[PDB]
Design a protein around this nucleic acid. Structure first.
Length: 98
RNA sequence: AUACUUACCUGGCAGGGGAGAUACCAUGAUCACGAAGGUGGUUUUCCCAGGGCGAGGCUUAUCCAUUGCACUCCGGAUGUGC
């Protein structure tokens, strides 16, 4: 609930393949700022979710405000901040610990 | 029903993966101990020559469950072609 470099998105349509989903998320989510990476998995735990890593928390915060509920494959998007910094975020800060 | 002699009617010969290495078996080699080799085995590397085991892996739908906070690929089963 506390702002983060990374936003967490869930309630995504599970039929879309990883490369398809990464592509359209980059397209959809680039409108708000420079994106370093979009990580998707289709595993049981990780299917239906994506992490968009922004350079600035403010793009993440603004992205959260705008896309909350956004229609995506017949489903409103749910967005949160990542609970923890992403390794590429944490190494840039030098906060990273295994 | 069996064997013997004759006439008539039918019909193509050689064979059983192949090339190397075998110290060991067989051939118990016709000259005062002996062969080599070869032939027929057993052992041993390959052009893989066809098969049997389908573990593992690749492509895509059906069914079931998941609202999941990851950054070392990977939820379970059936079907199509490898």
């Amino acid at each position: 609930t506390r702002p983060n470099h990374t936003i967490y998105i869930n309630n995504l349509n599970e039929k879309i393949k990883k490369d398809e989903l990464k592509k359209s998320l980059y397209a959809i989510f680039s409108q708000f700022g420079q994106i370093l990476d979009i990580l998707v998995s289709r595993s049981l735990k990780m299917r239906g979710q994506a992490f968009v890593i922004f350079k600035e928390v403010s793009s993440a915060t603004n992205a959260l405000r705008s896309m909350q509920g956004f229609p995506f494959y017949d489903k409103p998007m749910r967005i949160q901040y990542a609970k923890t910094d992403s390794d590429i975020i944490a190494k840039m800060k030098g906060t990273f610990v295994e």
